[PDB]
Amino acid sequence: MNFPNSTNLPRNPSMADYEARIFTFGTWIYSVNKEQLARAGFYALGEGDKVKCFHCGGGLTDWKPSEDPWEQHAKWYPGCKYLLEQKGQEYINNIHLTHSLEECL
Ligand SMILES: C[C@@H]1CN(CC(=O)N2CC(C)(C)c3ncc(Cc4ccc(F)cc4)cc32)[C@@H](CN2CCOC[C@H]2C)C[NH2+]1
Ligand code: NA
Ligand SMILES: [Zn+2]
Numbered sequence: 001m002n003f004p005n006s007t008n009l010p011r012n013p014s015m016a017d018y019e020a021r022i023f024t025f026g027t028w029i030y031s032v033n034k035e036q037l038a039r040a041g042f043y044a045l046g047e048g049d050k051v052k053c054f055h056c057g058g059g060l061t062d063w064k065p066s067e068d069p070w071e072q073h074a075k076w077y078p079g080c081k082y083l084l085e086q087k088g089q090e091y092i093n094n095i096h097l098t099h100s101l102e103e104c105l
Contacts, residue, residue: 004056006079015043015054031065040069041082055082075099 005011015021024044025034032049042051042060049063058077073083074095084092 002057004058004077004079006056006081008081010055010082011057012043012052012054015052021054030063032063032067032069037069040073041080041086042069042073053077053080053082056080071095 010016015024018038021038021041021043022034024046025038026044026046028034028044030049034044037044037051041053041055043054044051048061050059050061052059053073056077056079058073058080060072060076070083070087070091073080074087074092077083078092078096
């Protein structure tokens, strides 16, 4: 187990570009859209639907069609500086509140 990168510097600069990320997927059979994933800073590992964020290093799996890449990114890797850059702290807050509230019900 590795800690999430919370610095302003990407953990995997090889995957810093959208096109670089998109190449990793190949033919992608999974319920969640590869371009959507690549935009949320994810690249494929080639092991089921395992993705890793290029910046935080944060890893996700088992994508249900209801699950959103940016939402999941914020859920599991709230300290990601890439996430904060693209989405903003107001978005991130909303998502946390929504998830933390989802539990109540
Ligand atoms: C998209 C969504 C993700 N979600 C959480 C998830 O995928 N997380 C949460 C956690 C941070 C605990 C975690 N740690 C390891 C892996 C594995 C991994 C993947 C990529 C990789 F590069 C290296 C390792 C995944 C993972 C799914 C539900 N998860 C499925 C897994 O078991 C925990 C459960 C709650 C539902 N779908
Ligand atoms: Na592939
Ligand atoms: Zn990240």
